[PDB]
Ligand SMILES: *[C@@H]1O[C@H](CO)[C@@H](O)[C@H](O)[C@H]1NC(C)=O
């Protein structure tokens with residue numbers, strides 16, 4: 169169970185974004201129903217009043233939390249990958265629009281899942297803003313907790329992969345648009361019960377065999393990290 173508090177841009181805290189520039193759900197409950205509209209931007213997808221200004225090449229950092237800011241972030245048990253997607257805001261996240269900017273499942277050297285390192289990073293993971301058209305976008309951060317993912321939700325609704333999905337309203341101001349935004353996958357729709365990385369047993373299967381759900385990261389992605397950028401105790 170985890171939620172986004174806000175974002176940072178180039179290491180500058182944009183402030184509490186909950187229901188302001190994040191389309192925040194009412195609580196930190198996972199989405200599990202792969203067919204639900206809740207997969208798009210979680211259970212309360214609506215336009216919120218603010219959209220954070222960035223430029224292409226900026227570092228945009230999502231900051232997650234559990235109950236309060238800069239707490240335990242997410243239960244240790246919730247091992248799994250992290251992805252970030254982007255879509256034009258005009259889409260409202262409908263259609264084949266979600267382009268993947270970031271994927272991290274499991275770091276072989278460190279022996280740590282993305283979620284494990286997210287905790288260590290005080291809830292913070294980043295993407296570099298791509299050189300798409302200036303305009304309004306949705307950045308959809310997605311944490312998949314796999315601790316009950318050996319079952320399918322569709323078969324057993326008490327279990328299943330858990331999706332912690334947060335859509336941030338971001339406005340790209342300066343960009344040369346050298347990498348126009350390509351089509352993307354639909355949410356709901358890109359993940360089905362037979363998609364790799366939806367059903368997995370993290371207890372018996374080595375993490376080095378885990379394949380995260382497609383799609384692949386777009387060649388226009390400028391990178392990202394799971395790493396603390398800013399200190400919530402100070403700003
Ligand atoms: C999953 O969501 C679909 C689409 O909204 C809905 O029809 C279906 O009943 C849901 N399944 C469960 C068990 O909620």
Ligand SMILES: [Cu+2]
Pocket residue numbers: 169170243246
């Ligand atoms: Cu949880």
